[PDB]
């Protein structure tokens, strides 16, 4: 699947501090491609759309093409760990 106005990333599990906080961990490359500041509202899309705020991914995840969202958000958007999802800045 493709995206013209967002990016595609692989879903990974939340950082342990994240569940229930509507956080979307994105690396520097992803944030730059999306023109997303920390705190910007983004959407994760697969079967459905879920919304959350951008959080700085940790150094080990830089340039690994992943987005970290917790199990509730994965259920909301309809993705499993390792699935491709669309990440979109809410304009």
Swiss-Prot record:
Family membership: Belongs to the AAA ATPase family. CDC48 subfamily.
Subunit structure: Homohexamer. Forms a ring-shaped particle.
Name by which UniProt lists this protein: VCP-like ATPase
Protein's organism: Thermoplasma acidophilum (strain ATCC 25905 / DSM 1728 / JCM 9062 / NBRC 15155 / AMRC-C165)
């Amino acid at each position: 699947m493709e995206s013209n106005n967002g990016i595609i990333l692989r879903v990974a599990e939340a950082n342990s501090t994240d569940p229930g906080m509507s956080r979307v961990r994105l690396d520097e490359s992803s944030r730059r491609l999306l023109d997303a500041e920390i705190g910007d509202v983004v959407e994760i899309e697969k079967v459905r759309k879920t919304v959350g705020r951008v959080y700085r991914a940790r150094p080990e995840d830089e340039n690994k093409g992943i987005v970290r969202i917790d199990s509730v958000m994965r259920n909301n958007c309809g993705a499993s760990i390792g699935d491709k999802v669309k990440v979109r800045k809410v304009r």
